[PDB]
Amino acid sequence: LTEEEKQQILHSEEFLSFFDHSTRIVERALSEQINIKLSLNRQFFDERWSKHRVVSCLDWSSQYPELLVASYNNNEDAPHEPDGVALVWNMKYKKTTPEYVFHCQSAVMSATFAKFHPNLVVGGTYSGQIVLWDNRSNKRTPVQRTPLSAAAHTHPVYCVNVVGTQNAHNLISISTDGKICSWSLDMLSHPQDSMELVHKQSKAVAVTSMSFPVGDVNNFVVGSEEGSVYTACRHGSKAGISEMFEGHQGPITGIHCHAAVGAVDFSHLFVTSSFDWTVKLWTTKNNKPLYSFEDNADYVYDVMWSPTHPALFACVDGMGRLDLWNLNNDTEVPTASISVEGNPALNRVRWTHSGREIAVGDSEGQIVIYDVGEQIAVPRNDEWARFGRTLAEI
Amino acid sequence: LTEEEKQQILHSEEFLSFFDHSTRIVERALSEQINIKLSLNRQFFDERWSKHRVVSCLDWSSQYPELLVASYNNNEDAPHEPDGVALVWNMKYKKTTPEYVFHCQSAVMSATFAKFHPNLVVGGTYSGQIVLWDNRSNKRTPVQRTPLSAAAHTHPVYCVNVVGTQNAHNLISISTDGKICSWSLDMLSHPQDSMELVHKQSKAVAVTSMSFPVGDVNNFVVGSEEGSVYTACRHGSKAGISEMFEGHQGPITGIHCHAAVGAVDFSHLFVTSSFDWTVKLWTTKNNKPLYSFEDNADYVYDVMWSPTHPALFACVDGMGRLDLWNLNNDTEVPTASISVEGNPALNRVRWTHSGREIAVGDSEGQIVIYDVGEQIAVPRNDEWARFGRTLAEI
Amino acid sequence: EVEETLKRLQSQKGVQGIIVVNTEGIPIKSTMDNPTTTQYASLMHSFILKARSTVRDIDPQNDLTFLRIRSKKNEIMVAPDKDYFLIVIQNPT
Amino acid sequence: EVEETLKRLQSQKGVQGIIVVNTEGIPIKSTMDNPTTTQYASLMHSFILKARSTVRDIDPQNDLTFLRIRSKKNEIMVAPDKDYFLIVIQNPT
Amino acid sequence: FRIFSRFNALFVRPHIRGAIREYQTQLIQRVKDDIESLHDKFKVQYPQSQACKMSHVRDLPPVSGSIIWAKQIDRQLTAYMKRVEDVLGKGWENHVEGQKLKQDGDSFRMKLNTQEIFDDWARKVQQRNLGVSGRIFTIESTRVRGRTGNVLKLKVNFLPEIITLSKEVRNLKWLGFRVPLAIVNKAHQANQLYPFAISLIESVRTYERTCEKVEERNTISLLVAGLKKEVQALIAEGIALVWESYKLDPYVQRLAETVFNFQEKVDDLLIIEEKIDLEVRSLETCMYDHKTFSEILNRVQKAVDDLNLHSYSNLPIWVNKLDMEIERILGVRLQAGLR
Amino acid sequence: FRIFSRFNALFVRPHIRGAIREYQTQLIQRVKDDIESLHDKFKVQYPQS
């Protein structure tokens, strides 16, 4: 009768593949196969990693369009417990439990998947230290960490992304100070590129969020907490701010370029969600906003296009309501709307890849995903033509 | 016990419990989840049997799509060395040597796989004897050999093919003199049927290629050495040539009916490959060559329809360029076109029955297995309609 | 209807109709190669019987109808009623 | 980790009892008592060794990575890879 | 108002204007009710609204956050006023309802002033007199709970909150509020100097953590003593410096790289150390055989050689003590075997 | 051949005809000595082609 060999083999941690397959399979075992317009689909609220915790960012994995990453700042509930909380959440089979967890010693501000590698997850923190994490390996610590140096990011980083293809990739990050930095996925300890974005008279731009024209690398677009939107080329013949936009009165919070691609070219359309309920749509060739979204006041955070429909997008209000806003059918009234129960301060919204459903973050951490009407999800050539003519409206 | 009481117990009517059991287990087991361009594909070049000895014909085994018959004909280096050699080369595993080797007394001028016998290779030689090769036997010598009598072929036979159902076969072969003959695959001692192809009274046909349209076995198309393609009826009151085609002012070097099915029929179409770089997209119902792809200084040697794409077809050349013509995509420039190294006069093309990969002949014996791009190989469901429209263009 | 059962079963992925094995290890229904399926069903019958003994050791009131032998190649669904033991080969995908 | 593993594997359904077994049968851990855990897990280990032999019969390269039996009274779980043998006591539903 | 924005083409012709003045009173009352709702929302003070904590998540310093929130509320109120002015036509104030509404809006806007908080914050900044000038970092005395002695813990003379002030200015400057030139200078200097300070503080914290980890395992400090000496020398060189200088960047950079190299070599030495210790413990109970003993010793010697090729410090005495322990355990094992 | 075959019925226009082949007569020279390169094959190949 063994008494220590079992105890020591339990103490010895060779359970990596053990725990991996056990977790990936037991939630599968949760299935009950016993032989004897908007609509909520799946409400996810982790009790252990999201009690009174604010959603910081959201992302859907293009490589695996069932895998989501969500962030969190430090938890005011308990400082001693881990502060930077990162959750990887799944859509294989229903389960209250998150599929993966991740911790960072610093509060996590933004996160995303890597396009170069379909398993790595990269996230910017509050200390301005980019954090790498390996999904397949079972660990809590960051796998890699960019140095905290004058050359590297030092102010809190709020947007990070991967550009290029899977053999021409490049990880671009923005610090709110105005630093752009380009890293590689194979090494996360030295900036391959880095420069301090400057608009004029050498003053920097307090960048809050950034996006890029779909299907294109370089020639980036950034939003500033000063309330001004800029277009700045990454390398070109000259890096730095290329164009300053008349912009919105308050801070520009959620910026996104158009993404749907079809019979027409609309990759120059920008949606910006400022701090005045104002979801502004414009085009890069015109300095003035093309339209204004106004139904209330006070802070719609983020706006995001639907990758499949060309004239349809989402924007979530801090008042606690998500309205799906269409352009081809309407210009003043949301074609769809819903409110998360409890009326919570909904922070972030993310269209899932291929669309057909949406993900929403919350101040409480209860992220909710749910689909859209079929009659509203799917576009058609009519949608593109009428969208072109509605742009021609003014 | 034995297999009779089981029948009655099945006929017994206590199966309601068993039926409910099966229904429950099947309906519960229904849900399923997971647990967690032109390219040189390969080479095939013997050295013992492939010193010079240009390629003559190629084929893929329908039953074993991993097998390719070669037929290396000319002996000029050493009269003492074997005169005609046939090589069969496998696809599943890469080897520097053919899987089996066959040597025929004469020079083998065409070859193919037998359908009924999946263990047999039959070829026509220059002398005029149809020659067997049973791969069961360990003798490189031909197993069964047709006589060189007036009844059988007495001229260089260049076209052999076994067709019919698995229970109704006929090894057809037509020689340069033009005498068609069918044999039973198992009995080649005597020509079970023969008839000398003749055009308008007292006009023999210097036949040099044939192709049976897919499905049909009674009527087919033949390409003469005199540039004039004909259509003949294998069996019937009108048995023999039934059409006179203007064709091209050069000898025909290849012919092939259409090789696709599933949508609106195209079997009336067939491409010929002439001797002045003039491949002729063209149909039986009409009499004028529908179109006349031309370019180059040299001239084609073989052309084959894609087994899966109802537009694509290959095209050899004497300068060593192989070009795939995708008619729907374009009708003037080769959709794909690359030259094998060393600019040797390629002499044969045989698409794999899968249609995903192409072979090519060679003037020195190095058979090259080319792969093709996915977008350039697989047609779409819309592809057939586009082909119909393009044909309707003129 | 036996034929209705066969057509319903063959609709499942990687399943060739319905094959039923009695308590003798010989499949009352024939759908695959006889020797391989017979020996396979015999080993099936043996280990399901020892599983029945194993469960009755501590569960003298339970009955066996569900078992998921899944590998990285295929899963075999084995379901005994009292004499007819359905064996179903299905792809894990 | 140890305690977190069992805690999370258990509260997912309010599982009656699971103990971590990294050895070939005969576990000294317990969740509701020593006997019903140890002897039953040893019986499971003996049975799954035979099941592994069974899956290796059709082809020796096959190995069993996942096993469940859902009967009228219990649902038994084990996912062996090299020594990691699971036990789950749970309602049939 | 969307409904009217649909139709504006003969508002010049005063035939439709009769309808708009017919519902004019209902329009005015409903707008007043909406403004009342907005004012009620405003009455929820900024710290009591989730907008404050969220803007904190949004890197908005709370004073700047409240100021900008109030300014946006004012902007929305002005939007209501002008949009009513446009729809109803010129001079809606002339109506008793119009003048009452305009008085209500002006009073609300007066309650919605913003400069006073700006003034108070500036005064508080000036009174508190934030600064960074001084020593590169400060050494202080703290009696950490757990030990009787007074721990001279090493800190950095840099308040992490100073950058917050910078951000406030970096916001308030573009908000149109002008801040005193001394405050601009202090904030600018703090902003430009922040990266050096944060690199320094992270480096020193990492060094403290790794050194306490080392001394947690006394068996290894003797080897790492050289790296500790060079780090202490670098700190000694740095500390004499005043807070602002021109060697700050090179010194900070070399300190950071040295600390990082120190920490990584520390962890490598640590892991190889428990490897060797575990193998020694196994040798303690290893069964009596020349082959197994030889293999254990071979692996230990290979690990020692691996340390040697890394060119660490202080190897010989460490090897000597290890060999002494090995021979003592060997003597015990030989005793057992002999008896 | 194809690139001007796109015109075919275009250059019947009074101005297109002047727009074609007056500017390109030199490239007609160029295709001529392309023909020269063509006969190059014919020049020395007869029995060893």
CB contact A35 to C (< 8 Å): yes
Identify any residues that bridge with A293 across adjacent strands, giving them in sequence order.
Answer: none
Instruction: Give how far B335 is from chain A: nearest CA, Å.
Output: 24
Q: At what angle do helices E181-216 and E162-172 cross, to 10 degrees?
A: 150
CB contact B11 to C (< 8 Å): no
CA distance E237 to E141: 21
Name residues whose C-beta falls within 8 Å of residue B279's C-beta, 6 or more positions apart in sequence.
B271, B272, B273, B293, B300, B303, B313, B315, B325
Identify any residues that bridge with B69 across adjacent strands, giving them in sequence order.
Answer: B59, B88
Q: Select the residue of E38, E57, E202 nearest A297 (Cβ to Cβ).
A: E38
Helix (H) or strand (E) holding F34: helix F25-43
- A140 in Cβ contact with A127 (< 8 Å): no
Name residues whose C-beta falls within 8 Å of residue E295's C-beta, 6 or more positions apart in sequence.
none
Burial of A265 (0-12, 13-18, 19+ CB in 10 A): exposed
Distances (CA, A) of B177 to B49, B105, B219: 29, 21, 19
Q: Is B304 helix (H, G, I), strand (E, B) or coil?
A: coil
Kindly tell me the sign of the dihedral angle through the C-alpha atoms of A148, A153, A159, A160: negative
Furthest-apart CA pair in chain C: how many Å? 39
Q: Is A225 helix (H, G, I), strand (E, B) or coil?
A: coil
Instruction: Give how far C28 is from chain B: nearest CA, Å.
Output: 6
Name residues whose C-beta falls within 8 Å of residue A315's C-beta, 6 or more positions apart in sequence.
A254, A271, A273, A279, A293, A300, A302, A303, A304, A322, A323, A325, A349
Distances (CA, A) of E121 to A267, E68, E168, E179, E269: 44, 14, 10, 10, 52
Distances (CA, A) of A23 to B317, D9, D29: 60, 8, 21
Q: Is B46 helix (H, G, I), strand (E, B) or coil?
A: coil
Q: Which residues of C touch A26 (CB under 8 A)?
A: none
Name residues whose C-beta falls within 8 Å of residue A44's C-beta, 6 or more positions apart in sequence.
A89, A96, A98, A366, A367, A368, A369
Instruction: Give how far B121 is from chain F: nearest CA, Å.
Output: 33
Q: Which residues of B touch F36 (CB under 8 A)?
A: none
Helix (H) or strand (E) holding C38: helix C34-58
CA distance A214 to A258: 7
Q: Which residues of A touch E194 (CB under 8 A)?
A: 154
CA distance B378 to A185: 35
Interface test with chain E among A299, A319, A394, by most E beta carbons within 10 Å: A299
CA distance B303 to B298: 15
Displacement of CA B191 from its chain's centroid (Å): 23
Q: Which residues of D touch C73 (CB under 8 A)?
A: 59, 62
Q: At what angle do helices E181-216 and E218-239 cross, to 10 degrees?
A: 160
D39 φ/ψ angles, rounded to the nearest 5 degrees: -65, -40
E326 φ/ψ angles, rounded to the nearest 5 degrees: -60, -45
Q: How many CB atoms lie within 10 A of CB B95?
A: 10
Q: Is D16 helix (H, G, I), strand (E, B) or coil?
A: coil
Strand A300-305 and strand A279-283: pairing?
Answer: unpaired
Instruction: Give how far E175 is from chain A: nearest CA, Å.
Output: 8
**Tell me, what amino acid is at D44?**
M
Identify any residues that bridge with A160 across adjacent strands, giving them in sequence order.
Answer: A173
Q: In what order do the strands lie in the sheet with B84-90?
A: B59-60, B67-69, B84-90, B100-104
**Phi-psi label, residue E322: left if phi above 0, alpha if psi -120 to 50, beta otherwise:** alpha
A230 φ/ψ angles, rounded to the nearest 5 degrees: -125, 150
Give me the DSSP letters along C59-85. -TT------EEE-SS-EEEEEESSS-E
- A337 in Cβ contact with A323 (< 8 Å): yes
Q: Do E195 and A154 touch (CB under 8 A)?
A: yes
List, as own/partner pairs, every contact residues B82-86 make where C-beta atoms lie below 8 angstroms and the sequence separation is at least 24, other chains included: B82/B49, B83/B107, B84/B108, B84/B109, B84/B125, B84/B126, B85/B49, B85/B50, B85/B53, B86/B111, B86/B121, B86/B123, B86/B133
Q: At what angle do helices E62-88 and E115-128 cross, to 10 degrees?
A: 170
CA distance B370 to F9: 41
Burial of E109 (0-12, 13-18, 19+ CB in 10 A): middle
Displacement of CA B296 from its chain's centroid (Å): 26
In total, the C-beta contacts within 8 angstroms joining chain C to chain D are: 68
Interface test with chain A among D8, D18, D88, by most A beta carbons within 10 Å: D8
Using the CB atoms, write b or e for A48-62: b if 16+ within 10 Å. ebbeebbbbbbbbbe
CA distance B385 to E174: 63
Q: Which residues of C touch D55 (CB under 8 A)?
A: 69, 71
Q: Do E73 and A176 touch (CB under 8 A)?
A: no
Instruction: Give how far F46 is from chain B: nearest CA, Å.
Output: 14
Q: Which residues of B touch A25 (CB under 8 A)?
A: 35
Q: Which two tokens stand for residue B214?
A: 């897919």
Which residue in B75, B44, B49 sits closest to B60, CA to CA? B44
D81 φ/ψ angles, rounded to the nearest 5 degrees: -120, -60
Q: Which residues of A touch E195 (CB under 8 A)?
A: 149-150, 154
CA distance A49 to A88: 11
CA distance A360 to A368: 5
Instruction: Quote the Cα angle for B289-B295-B296, to 5°.
Output: 135
Instruction: Quote the Cα angle for D53-D59-D65, to 5°.
Output: 60
CA distance A210 to A161: 9
Chains contacting E with at least 3 CB pairs below 8 Å? A
Q: Do A10 and D2 touch (CB under 8 A)?
A: yes
Which residue in B225, B170, B228 sits closest to B200, CA to CA? B228
Is domain C1-93 in CATH 3.20.20.80, yes or no? no
CB contact A35 to B (< 8 Å): yes
CB contact A31 to C (< 8 Å): no
CA distance A379 to A312: 9
- How was this structure obtained? cryo-EM
- A352 in Cβ contact with A369 (< 8 Å): yes
Instruction: Give how far A32 is from chain D: nearest CA, Å.
Output: 6
Q: Is D65 helix (H, G, I), strand (E, B) or coil?
A: coil
Q: Which two tokens stand for residue A13?
A: 């941690």
Q: Select the residue of C2, C12, C86 nearest B10 (Cβ to Cβ).
A: C2
A338 φ/ψ angles, rounded to the nearest 5 degrees: -165, 160
In total, the C-beta contacts within 8 angstroms joining chain A to chain B are: 18
List E residues 213-272 in contact with A (Cβ-Cβ < 8 A).
249, 253, 256, 260
Q: Is F42 helix (H, G, I), strand (E, B) or coil?
A: helix
Using the CB atoms, write b or e for C46-55: b if 16+ within 10 Å. ebbeebeebb
Q: Which two tokens stand for residue A238?
A: 């000259």
Q: Select the residue of D12, D23, D79 nearest A30 (Cβ to Cβ).
A: D12
CA distance A102 to C14: 39
CB contact A93 to D (< 8 Å): no
Q: Is A382 helix (H, G, I), strand (E, B) or coil?
A: helix
CA distance B276 to F28: 24
Q: Do C24 and B22 touch (CB under 8 A)?
A: no
CA distance C90 to E165: 66
- B387 in Cβ contact with B310 (< 8 Å): yes
Q: Count the residues in chain F.
A: 49
Nearest CA in chain A to E39: A297
CB contact E60 to A (< 8 Å): yes
- B160 in Cβ contact with B130 (< 8 Å): yes
CA distance B55 to B302: 12
Contact between chain E and chain D (3 or more Cβ pairs less than 8 Å apart): no
Helix (H) or strand (E) holding B232: strand B229-233
CA distance A101 to A82: 11
Kindly tell me the sign of the dihedral angle through the C-alpha atoms of E39, E44, E47, E51: negative
Q: Which residues of A touch B28 (CB under 8 A)?
A: 33-35
Q: Do C70 and D65 touch (CB under 8 A)?
A: yes
Q: Do B332 and F41 touch (CB under 8 A)?
A: no
Q: Is B101 helix (H, G, I), strand (E, B) or coil?
A: strand
Distances (CA, A) of E72 to A92, B390, D13, E152: 43, 62, 49, 50
CA distance E141 to E143: 7
Kindly tell me the sign of the dihedral angle through the C-alpha atoms of E209, E215, E221, E226: positive
Q: Count the residues in chain A.
A: 394
Which residue in A228, A203, A300, A299 sits closest to E169, CA to CA? A203
Q: Do C92 and B35 touch (CB under 8 A)?
A: yes
Using the CB atoms, write b or e for E42-55: b if 16+ within 10 Å. beeebeebbbbbbb
Chains contacting F with at least 3 CB pairs below 8 Å? B
CA distance E118 to A163: 42
- E65 in Cβ contact with E46 (< 8 Å): yes
Distances (CA, A) of A130 to A89, A347, D11, E39, E194: 21, 22, 34, 42, 18
Using the CB atoms, write b or e for A21-33: b if 16+ within 10 Å. bbbebbbbbeeeb
Q: Is F33 helix (H, G, I), strand (E, B) or coil?
A: helix
Residue for token pair 């794999």: B352
CA distance E254 to D13: 55
- B272 in Cβ contact with B279 (< 8 Å): yes
Identify any residues that bridge with A43 across adjacent strands, giving them in sequence order.
Answer: A368
Contact between chain F and chain C (3 or more Cβ pairs less than 8 Å apart): no
Sorted by where each begins, the domain ranges of chain D are 1-93
Using the CB atoms, write b or e for E270-281: b if 16+ within 10 Å. bebbeebeebee
**Tell me, what amino acid is at E190?**
A
Experimental structure resolution, Å: 3.5
Strand B168-175 and strand B179-183: pairing?
Answer: antiparallel
Q: Count the residues in chain E.
A: 339
Q: Select the residue of E2, E194, E256 nearest A149 (Cβ to Cβ).
A: E256
CB contact D91 to C (< 8 Å): no
CA distance A98 to A75: 18
CA distance A352 to A372: 11
CA distance E23 to A301: 35
A127: Cα within 13 Å, side-chain hemisphere: 21
Name residues whose C-beta falls within 8 Å of residue A58's C-beta, 6 or more positions apart in sequence.
A68, A69, A70, A348, A349, A350, A359, A361, A367
Helix (H) or strand (E) holding F27: helix F25-43
Instruction: Give how far D58 is from chain C: nearest CA, Å.
Output: 7
- A32 in Cβ contact with D93 (< 8 Å): yes
CA distance F22 to E16: 68
> If you ran DSSP here, which 8-state letter would residue B187 be given?
B
Furthest-apart CA pair in chain F: how many Å? 51
CA distance B158 to A86: 72
Q: Which residues of B touch C22 (CB under 8 A)?
A: 6
Q: At what angle do helices E62-88 and E24-43 cross, to 10 degrees?
A: 180
CB contact A167 to C (< 8 Å): no
Which residue in E73, E81, E89, E102 sits closest to E24, CA to CA? E89
CA distance C21 to C76: 13
3-state SS, one letter per residue, for chain E: CHHHHHCCCCCCCCCCHHHHHHCHHHHHHHHHHHHHHHHHHHHCCHHHCHHHHHHHHCCCCHHHHHHHHHHHHHHHHHHHHHHHHHHHCCCHHHCHHHHHHHHHHHHHHHHCCCHHHHHHHHHHHHHHCCCCCCECCCECCECCCCCCCCECCECCCCCCCHHHHHHHHHHHCCCCCCCCHHHHHHHHHHHHHHHHHHHHHHHHHHHHHHHHHHHHCHHHHHHHHHHHHHHHHHHHHHHCCECCCCCHHHHHHHHHHHHHHHHHHHHHHHHHHHHHHHHHHHHHHCCCCHHHHHHHHHHHHHHHHHHHHCCCCCHHHHHHHHHHHHHHHHHHHHHHHHC
CA distance C1 to B387: 47
CA distance A146 to A190: 7
CA distance A110 to A57: 5
- A74 in Cβ contact with A80 (< 8 Å): no
Burial of B14 (0-12, 13-18, 19+ CB in 10 A): exposed
Burial of E319 (0-12, 13-18, 19+ CB in 10 A): middle
Q: Which residues of D touch A35 (CB under 8 A)?
A: 70
- B115 in Cβ contact with B162 (< 8 Å): yes
Q: Do B29 and C77 touch (CB under 8 A)?
A: yes
In total, the C-beta contacts within 8 angstroms joining chain A to chain E are: 81
Q: Count the residues in chain C.
A: 93
Name residues whose C-beta falls within 8 Å of residue B100's C-beta, 6 or more positions apart in sequence.
B87, B88, B135
Instruction: Give how far C23 is from chain D: nearest CA, Å.
Output: 17
Nearest CA in chain F to B298: F41
Enumerate the H helices of chain B as residue ranges. 5-11, 15-29, 374-377, 381-393
Q: Do A225 and E60 touch (CB under 8 A)?
A: yes
Q: Which residues of C touch D45 (CB under 8 A)?
A: none
> If you ran DSSP here, which 8-state letter would residue C13 be given?
T
